[PDB]
Design a protein around this ligand. Structure first.
Ligand SMILES: CCCCCCCCCCCCCCCCCC(=O)OC[C@H](COP(=O)([O-])OCC(O)COP(=O)([O-])OC[C@@H](COC(=O)CCCCCCCCCCCCCCCCC)OC(=O)CCCCCCCCCCCCCCCCC)OC(=O)CCCCCCCCCCCCCCCCC
Ligand SMILES: CCCCCCCCCCCCCCCCCC(=O)OC[C@H](COP(=O)(O)OCCN)OC(=O)CCCCCCCCCCCCCCCCC
Ligand SMILES: CCCCCCCCCCCCCCCCCC(=O)OC[C@H](COP(=O)(O)OCCN)OC(=O)CCCCCCCCCCCCCCCCC
Ligand SMILES: CCCCCCCCCCCCO[C@@H]1O[C@H](CO)[C@@H](O[C@H]2O[C@H](CO)[C@@H](O)[C@H](O)[C@H]2O)[C@H](O)[C@H]1O
Ligand SMILES: CCCCCCCCCCCCO[C@@H]1O[C@H](CO)[C@@H](O[C@H]2O[C@H](CO)[C@@H](O)[C@H](O)[C@H]2O)[C@H](O)[C@H]1O
Ligand SMILES: CCCCCCCCCCCCO[C@@H]1O[C@H](CO)[C@@H](O[C@H]2O[C@H](CO)[C@@H](O)[C@H](O)[C@H]2O)[C@H](O)[C@H]1O
Lengths: 459, 606, 103, 171, 170, 126
């Protein structure tokens, strides 16, 4: 992975040694080049994973997440450079440095072979993320959002640290390849119940599981755009990726320990989907949409079937691009009217025709129109949960109806109807904004032509 | 085979070319609508060649050209079923769409986004053809949801209008409720048969098919606006008239019926599913025909006519006559599309007036639209040897002589009488009597685009049923022996409907003033179903969202039980620890208590 | 219950301005100042060539040399055979049916 | 906010429109329109206003019982089939300020005249504000009514968004 | 182009044209036009492309995997042997998925080919599909997303123990 | 036949008996309502018509509404017999309900599979 770690590190001297007026041009260009080289991780085999060294390996799960991570960095620089224009040069470079350091931690997190190494990098991503929200967030409540984000994570991740160290004492290793062969079944006992909870709760809080999700709508409403993009696109998936790995060593206890969390997710997705119908803040609505989509991923991971694991992987990639798009679309309205209230600016299709097309395409992927990878992932999960229990189709089906209602409600309210009379500063869409939208949707829709590369190891 | 398969695919590829040309490659925006209309007309020609080959020898084939994805033992390929149902539907859909698109070149002439309008009509047609030629359920689902989304964009065409946005979302809501059934069938077929391909489903031929078929019945209910998920179809009149013509004839609404026809190898062995569809269709055909009796908006009368005719198709499925249900789809496409086109001609001439109470006296003012409207009404009511007679009358005889629910049979016959009444209502109020429209007369139906497009559908509305019925190969044993009163029931009840309709219509001219009954109010307000359901259900769901899900749970109790209470405990604990008086005496006193407790209580000195 | 004299005066003044504004929406003659049966068959001839002949060449080439070179990609229903038919592949003659009872 | 006279005249217009919806035919509607007008005429000169209010209340109850459940609506009236149909084509005039110079160059005459209107608006605004100040009582306006211009060369206060509103058929 | 034994096909029996009408068959003339206007030009282009290919003949090979000891012959926790046994099991698992796909493809082609006589004429294909699906289900069903040769062996032994128990009591 | 109002069908204004019995005290209140509306209308129009303004006319009523519908709830929340019973009834209750629905369904299915009475003849995808 050094071929990706080192050029990612080199982005920092590049940004600090650039001409004052070329920091965005240089950092954007070269992080796109890094993104290009990340397609070499597609050398995946039918049986064995791509095992680079003692520290890092890649397989069909981490590879799509790695490519999404490295693609998002140039998109985040594009999205941020406008609202940061007044910021002084040194603080602009510090912002870019936090984004670069976040990518470095993420690519190491997704390829770490040893689980304790994964833990440290999994935890390291908090620091830059918290700095981005609290330092460059706009409103007073970013400080509270920083605290809720920090302490929800640590409340769960500290027990995970104890469990992981305990496993290494008992098994002798935390290398994931070793655990694949030395895994022993988890017997029933109260000690093992709490070992299971310690191994899972940290990832649940990040997903987030319904009931532990209240930190996420806060974080989004306060974060700058780049913070929201990385939060929705990648940082939520640290939980899913972690769960997909650690469930290896929790069998067969997961058979019954998953029940409370399947109930929370199955009922949670309908609650959060219903909540979206009444949200008044556009960022908050998109945030609640994420909780509903990720509730599907939790269920898929917990029932552990080949179809559910393939659907979970596709959903994680598909949601990453869609939710990042939706935040970017909402932000482009914010940069004009400086309010997140959904009902403030209406009938924008009359004033911004092409931006309304991006709004339509994003909404259609959010409601999972076939054959988008959003639908492929959701469908594979629905198929597998039907076998788990036929009654789940009723809950899955109801959520599909509610998802369409709130996705189109968001499109109708902001883009259709009559424009607001007094809002007279809706200037035409910039080339930057249009390019940013298309750099989300185009790879998303292109993936429909070759979905296998985002279906994960079980493919 | 090489010509058959090559030409069937070229039809579909031909339709996608005007869409590809939107990438400004070699585009002539001057007349994009003509370009799109020309593509449809050429696609109709190419589709007649394989259709002719099927009629000659019964040539059928499946084209699995592109391997898309393999999920372990489930291999998904882009596969096209060029069979009986796709061979006869495609030319009919293209022929009808050809008239609708030519008509739209006149009707939508002054629309600034006419180019986008014709693109959406073309995308509508493409997703329907994907639906009709799909050989596996995932491909079919692509077309299934595609037509739904294209319905949303075309119903809400005039998006500055709140009612249009409401109607468009309502179509999505009801169709997604039906889609719950569709995914249920997909899940059942994968879990139990390990397939989404029609071949494997029919070969394995499960006997325990209740669950998958109820799911398909639910999907058809939503898509074909059967009772329970029906209100959205009359609400779809918000869209431009060409949308209604295409929506109600060659595309969206017949998809639900087509889905059940495609699965007849399963339904024909399931009497329980037959009873359900029979009774669902019967209440639909009766209830919506009753609603049409008192509607005043011309587009709504014809919309309720479609719901009634769709219910009849669902009855034909119920009595295990899938090929008769398919024939009605094909015949209905001609005269129903014409009826909307004729109504659009009237609406345009009266400056967007759609209330029949403001029409009248048009029989001579619009002679050609009158002729088409009369022919279309006669085809709809089953006048012998017009296009509608070759399906409906066979359906009524088949139902009359079948082993079937007696109530469903009666409801269907009454609905046939009601068809005569509401067709009479349109003719009487729109064409006869004296004009009731404003004084500045702007009547003019002399545009060749209007005349020619309606003309072609008029010719189809006369001969298409005869031509189709004489060329399709028999797949059943038609019942042709029956008593005289079961053979002519359709004709008699229709005639009585016309006579009774004339009594009602002429009574409106008497200088007598009448109070409304409950039956009249029930019919006018559509059985109160939209009034009750569209207020109550949204209120209950939307109230649950804010009051309980959002505020009660996510902004209160999930906050209280953890972060809010935990912070209080630490703050209280901190004030205990730090609120000290800074006195040497008190600190050393606590040292003594600590040393004593360490020994007497805990024996740390041992 | 008519206009007050002040209401009448205001409406008259706005009416003068509104009509002047609407007149000023008329385009001048030069606006928009823009920057720099034999035919019928030919129009339909070029369309048939580019939208039917070229696509069918591509589809036929694709079907003949890529799709039909793989198993079961195109599967035909086997032709119906009736009593009295002759087979091209073998030359086999299918025997006729029995003699029908009179009816 | 409605007087007794306004309430009566609104019911008369409303009752006739529902009557016309029941009758349909013009000769039939004419006959019953005269009968209804006679009913309003018998109590035209009622003086006991308590009786007049009771007559109005009873008439409204009669209207509610006998109203058409699906009355005729003019196409572009609220609830009509063309209501709000052309709102998607209405674009505010401030959008022309964001046109690219090459777009403006296609209509040199239109935009020269547009600048004259913007100049007129700019030079009129201060006087419009002052007129409203000096004509408004201390506690702010008590009604939504606005005054005419008083001097010559003045424009009626707050005229721009009325005069320059989108056309009813803007495309 | 493909092995006819793996993807079998019955000998095709086409009837000869036997017109009973004086009208010409429009399909006959369209077939001639299609052969002249579409097929012949397409064939010429392909033959040009095939000539270029014949000038640059080169080869690729089907990878052969030697057999290695399976998970039954691996000592507990001996990762080096387990790894080779596990990878082999995963390759066989992928092969068994495609064998089921081949049989399903045979079944689906028979159903379409035999038309309205498919319920009778496709019995052999249906029987073969039933058996391979049963064999595949025994091997791999219920193993979960974190499947392995170890879990597959444990399932087999559970099935073997049940089969022995029933046989004893008989 | 009197009009019966419901939550989703209001009483028509012409059938409201309070609509006609209008006192000088009720006309005084209507005048004060129109004064507030007119005062706000003027404040809005002075900004709406200002030729030099470009942006959004911030509406405190809209800001108050979005603030009330979120941030203002928990400060004014009191744990008492109502919110606790509604909190329990619709917070824990559905999870327990669905747990028993799915748990019962899965126990029945697993018991049939072990006994070999569930038909899984062609079930090889999961
Ligand atoms: C190698 C690598 C390749 C790189 C990628 C290449 C593809 C990208 C093409 C880039 C060039 C785009 C371009 O220049 O066209 C301009 C094109 C036409 O110019 P325009 O009229 O001025 O556009 C103005 C409006 O935005 C136009 O808005 P509009 O409303 O008129 O149309 C926009 C349209 C969006 O465009 C479409 O998606 C076409 C319809 C789908 C086909 O929106 C829809 O119609 C939504 C319909 C979705 C439902 C359709 C049913 C689903 C069936 C799915 C079938 C699946 C296969 C089986 O404008 C656009 O469409 C902008 C978006 C372009 C990206 C769309 C995604 C394409 C992939
Ligand atoms: C806040 C104040 C409260 C602080 C936490 C209270 C302690 C909770 C301890 C739970 C019980 C864990 C335990 O003690 O297990 C000990 C036992 C070790 O015995 P051993 O010989 O190694 O193995 C045989 C098992 N008897 O077996 C084990 O070691 C297995 C335990 C593995 C490590 C457990 C990690 C901590 C579990 C507690 C947290 C789980 C819930 C996390 C919730 C977070 C939500 C955000
Ligand atoms: C149920 C599935 C639902 C699918 C949902 C996704 C929808 C996506 C949009 C549909 C696109 C429709 C067109 C599909 C064909 C496009 C791809 C293609 O034709 O090339 C792939 C094909 C490779 O062969 P194949 O084995 O089928 O592919 C396996 C790997 N996927 O290549 C070939 O076999 C032949 C390639 C050479 C072509 C020669 C002809 C060239 C003609 C000149 C250029 C024009
Ligand atoms: C033996 C241990 C020590 C190892 C030291 C190795 C590196 C030594 C570098 C010495 C030269 C540093 O150069 C010094 O810093 C930067 C980058 O050049 C320059 O100033 C910079 O300003 C801005 C960025 O802030 C940019 O326009 C540009 O990067 C540069 O002009 C100073 O004008 C220069 O004086
Ligand atoms: C279950 C696993 C995760 C559990 C995580 C729980 C740990 C605590 C997380 C939040 C920590 C924030 O720490 C502190 O919390 C309180 C509210 O809770 C905040 O205070 C906020 O809510 C309180 C209570 O309504 C208000 O009085 C205050 O005006 C407001 O700012 C403090 O400003 C913050 O400093
Ligand atoms: C699962 C285990 C997780 C353990 C995590 C431990 C997190 C500890 C966080 C710090 C706790 C103290 O944090 C402190 O709490 C109090 C009470 O909420 C807050 O106090 C605030 O809320 C209270 C509650 O209405 C108000 O009365 C007060 O006026 C306001 O300032 C402080 O603003 C905050 O600084």
């Amino acid at each position: 992975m050094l071929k990706y770690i080192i050029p990612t590190i080199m982005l920092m001297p590049l940004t600090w040694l650039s001409k004052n007026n070329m920091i965005w041009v240089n950092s954007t260009a070269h992080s796109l080049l890094i993104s290009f080289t990340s397609l070499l991780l597609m050398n995946q085999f039918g049986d064995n994973s791509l095992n680079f060294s003692l520290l890092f390996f890649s397989d069909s799960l981490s590879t799509p997440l790695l490519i999404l991570t490295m693609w998002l960095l140039p998109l985040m620089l594009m999205a941020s450079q406008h609202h940061l224009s007044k910021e002084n040069l040194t603080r602009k470079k510090l912002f870019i440095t936090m984004l670069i350091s976040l990518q470095l931690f993420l690519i190491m997190t997704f390829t770490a072979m040893e689980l304790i190494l994964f833990y440290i990098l999994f935890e390291a991503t908090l620091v830059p993320t918290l700095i981005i929200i609290t330092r460059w967030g706009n409103q007073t409540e970013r400080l509270n959002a920083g605290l809720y984000f920090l302490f929800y994570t640590l409340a769960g991740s500290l027990p995970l640290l104890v469990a992981l160290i305990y496993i290494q004492n008992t098994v002798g290793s935390l290398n994931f390849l070793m655990l694949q062969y030395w895994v022993q079944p988890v017997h029933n006992s109260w000690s093992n119940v709490f070992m299971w909870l310690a191994c899972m709760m940290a990832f649940m809080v990040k997903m987030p599981l319904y009931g532990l999700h209240l930190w996420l709508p806060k974080a989004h409403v306060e974060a700058p755009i780049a913070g929201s993009m990385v939060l929705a696109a990648v940082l939520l998936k640290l939980g899913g990726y972690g769960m997909l790995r650690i469930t290896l060593i929790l069998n067969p206890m997961t058979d019954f320990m998953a029940y409370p969390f399947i109930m929370l997710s199955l009922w949670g997705m309908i609650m959060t989907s219903s909540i979206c119908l009444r949200q008044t803040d556009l960022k908050s609505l998109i945030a609640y949409s994420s909780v509903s989509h990720m509730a599907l991923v939790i269920v898929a991971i917990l029932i552990q079937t080949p179809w559910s694991y393939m659907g979970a992987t596709a959903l994680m990639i598909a949601h990453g691009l869609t939710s990042s798009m939706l935040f970017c679309l909402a932000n482009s309205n914010y940069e004009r009217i400086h309010s997140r209230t959904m009902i403030l600016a209406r009938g924008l299709q009359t004033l911004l025709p092409l931006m309304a097309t991006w709004w339509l395409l994003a909404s259609l992927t959010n409601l999972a129109l076939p054959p988008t990878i959003n639908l492929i992932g959701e469908l594979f999960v629905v198929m597998s949960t039907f076998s788990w229990s036929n009654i789940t189709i009723i809950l899955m089906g109801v959520n599909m109806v509610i998802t369409a209602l709130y996705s189109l409600y968001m499109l109708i309210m902001t883009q259709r109807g009559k424009y607001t009379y007094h809002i007279n500063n809706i200037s035409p869409s910039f080339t930057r904004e249009n390019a940013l939208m298309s750099l989300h949707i185009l790879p998303l829709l292109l993936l429909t032509l070759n979905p296998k590369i985002i279906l994960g190891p079980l493919y | 085979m090489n010509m058959f398969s090559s030409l069937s695919l070229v039809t579909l590829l031909l339709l996608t070319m005007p869409i590809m040309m939107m990438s400004f490659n070699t585009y002539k925006p001057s007349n994009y609508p003509l370009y799109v209309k020309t593509a449809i007309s050429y696609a109709f020609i190419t589709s007649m060649i394989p259709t002719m080959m099927f009629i000659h020898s019964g040539q059928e084939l499946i084209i699995s050209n592109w391997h898309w994805l393999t999920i372990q033992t489930l291999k998904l390929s882009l596969s096209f079923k060029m069979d009986y149902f796709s061979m006869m539907f495609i030319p009919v859909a293209l022929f009808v769409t050809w008239s609708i698109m030519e008509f739209s070149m006149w009707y939508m002439y002054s629309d600034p986004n006419i180019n986008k309008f014709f693109k959406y009509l073309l995308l509508f047609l493409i997703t329907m053809l994907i639906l009709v030629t799909a050989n596996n359920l995932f491909q079919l689902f692509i077309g299934w949801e595609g037509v739904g989304i294209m319905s949303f964009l075309l119903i809400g065409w005039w998006y500055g209008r709140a009612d249009a946005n409401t109607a468009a979302l309502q179509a999505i809501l009801y169709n997604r409720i039906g889609d719950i059934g569709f995914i249920l069938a997909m899940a059942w077929f994968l879990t139990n048969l390990n397939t989404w391909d029609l071949q494997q489903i029919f070969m394995l031929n499960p006997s325990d098919s209740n669950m998958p078929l109820i799911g398909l019945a639910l999907a058809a209910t939503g898509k074909s606006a059967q009772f329970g998920l029906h209100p959205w179809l009359p609400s779809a009149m918000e869209g431009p008239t060409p949308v209604s013509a295409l929506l109600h004839s060659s595309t969206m609404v017949v998809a639900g019926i087509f889905l059940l026809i495609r699965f007849y190898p399963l339904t024909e062995n399931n009497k329980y599913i037959q009873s359900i569809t029979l009774c669902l269709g019967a209440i639909t055909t009766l209830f919506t025909a009753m609603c049409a009796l008192t509607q005043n908006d011309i587009k709504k009368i014809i919309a309720f006519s479609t719901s009634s005719q769709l219910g009849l198709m669902m009855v034909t499925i119920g009595i295990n006559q899938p090929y008769l249900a398919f024939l009605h789809i094909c015949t209905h496409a001609f005269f129903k599309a014409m009826l909307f086109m004729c109504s659009g001609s009237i609406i345009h001439s009266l400056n967007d007036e759609q209330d029949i109470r403001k029409m009248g006296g048009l029989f001579k003012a619009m002679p050609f639209t009158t002729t088409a409207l009369i022919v279309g009404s006669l085809a709809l009511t089953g006048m012998p040897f017009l296009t509608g007679f070759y399906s409906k009358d066979l359906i009524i005889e088949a139902a009359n002589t079948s082993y079937t629910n007696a109530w469903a049979l009666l409801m269907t016959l009454i609905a046939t009488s009601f068809t005569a009444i509401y067709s009479t209502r349109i003719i009487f109020f729109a064409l006869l009597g004296q004009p009731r429209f404003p004084t500045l007369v702007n009547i003019n139906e002399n545009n060749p685009l209007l005349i020619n497009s309606i003309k072609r559908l008029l010719i189809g509305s006369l001969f298409a049923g005869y031509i189709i019925s004489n060329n399709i190969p028999p797949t059943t044993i038609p019942q042709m022996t029956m008593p005289y009163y079961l053979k002519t029931t359709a004709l008699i009840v229709t005639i009585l409907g016309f006579i009774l309709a004339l009594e009602i219509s002429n009574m409106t001219k008497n200088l007598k003033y009448h109070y409304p009954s409950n039956a009249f109010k029930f019919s006018t307000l559509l059985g109160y179903f939209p009034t009750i359901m569209h207020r109550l259900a949204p209120y209950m769901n939307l109230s649950m969202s804010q009051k309980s899900a959002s505020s009660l749970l996510d902004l209160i109790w999930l906050e209280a039980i953890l972060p809010k209470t935990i912070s209080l405990a630490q703050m209280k604990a901190s004030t205990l620890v730090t609120n000290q008086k800074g006195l040497i005496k008190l600190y050393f006193l606590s040292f003594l208590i600590t040393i004593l407790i360490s020994m007497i209580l805990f024996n740390f000195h041992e | 219950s008519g206009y007050t004299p002040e209401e009448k005066l205001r409406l008259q003044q706005l009416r003068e301005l509104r009509r002047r504004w609407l007149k000023d929406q008329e385009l001048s003659p030069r606006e928009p100042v823009l920057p720099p049966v034999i035919y019928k068959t030919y129009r339909h001839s070029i369309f048939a060539f580019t939208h039917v002949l070229i696509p069918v060449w591509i589809i036929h080439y694709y079907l003949k040399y890529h799709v039909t070179t793989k198993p079961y990609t195109i599967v035909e229903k086997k032709p119906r055979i009736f009593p009295g038919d002759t087979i091209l592949e073998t030359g086999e003659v299918i025997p006729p049916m029995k003699e029908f009872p009179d009816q | 906010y409605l007087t007794h006279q306004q309430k009566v005249l609104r019911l008369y217009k409303r009752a006739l429109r529902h009557l016309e919806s029941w009758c349909i035919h013009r000769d039939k509607y004419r006959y019953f329109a005269c009968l209804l007008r006679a009913r309003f005429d018998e109590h035209k000169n009622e003086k006991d206003m308590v009786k007049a209010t009771q007559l109005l209340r009873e008439a409204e109850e009669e209207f509610w019982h006998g109203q058409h459940p699906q009355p005729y609506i003019f196409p572009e009236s609220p609830g009509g089939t063309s209501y709000e149909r052309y709102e998607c084509y209405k674009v505010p005039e401030w959008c022309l300020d964001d046109w690219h110079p090459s777009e403006k160059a296609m209509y040199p005459d239109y935009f020269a005249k547009r600048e004259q209107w913007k100049k007129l608006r700019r030079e009129s605004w201060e006087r419009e504000v002052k007129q409203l100040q000096e004509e408004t009582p201390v506690g702010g306006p008590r009604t939504e009514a606005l005054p005419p211009a008083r001097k010559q060369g003045d424009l009626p206060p707050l005229w721009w968004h009325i005069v320059t509103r989108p056309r009813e058929r803007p495309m | 182009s493909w092995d006819k034994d793996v993807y079998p096909e019955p000998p095709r029996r086409t009837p000869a044209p036997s017109p009973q009408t004086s009208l010409p068959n429009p399909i006959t003339y369209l077939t001639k036009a299609f052969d002249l206007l579409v097929d012949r030009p397409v064939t010429l282009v392909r033959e040009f492309i095939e000539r270029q290919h014949a000038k640059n003949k080169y080869y690729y090979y089907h990878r052969e995997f030697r057999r290695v000891p399976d998970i039954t012959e691996c000592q507990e926790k001996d990762v080096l042997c387990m790894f080779e046994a596990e990878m082999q099991w995963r390759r066989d698992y992928k092969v068994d998925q495609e064998i089921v796909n081949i049989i399903q493809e045979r079944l689906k082609a028979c159903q379409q080919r035999e038309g309205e006589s498919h319920r009778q004429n496709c019995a052999k294909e249906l029987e073969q599909f039933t058996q391979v699906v049963k064999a595949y289900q025994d091997r791999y069903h219920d193993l979960g997303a974190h499947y392995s040769a170890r879990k597959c062996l444990a399932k087999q032994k559970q099935r073997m123990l049940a089969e022995r128990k029933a046989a004893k009591e008989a | 036949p009197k009009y019966e109002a419901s939550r989703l069908s209001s009483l028509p204004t012409t059938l409201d008996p309070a609509e006609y019995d209008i006192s000088s005290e009720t006309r005084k209140a209507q005048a004060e309502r129109l004064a507030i509306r007119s005062r706000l209308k003027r404040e809005y129009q002075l900004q709406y018509y200002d030729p030099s303004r470009r942006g959004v006319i911030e509406d405190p009523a809209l800001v108050r509404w979005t603030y009330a519908r979120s941030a203002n709830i928990y400060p004014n929340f009191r744990p008492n017999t109502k919110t606790s019973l509604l909190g329990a009834l619709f917070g824990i209750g559905p999870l327990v309900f669905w747990y028993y629905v799915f748990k019962t369904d899965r126990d029945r299915k697993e018991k049939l599979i072990q006994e070999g009475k569930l038909d899984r003849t062609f079930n090889i995808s999961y």
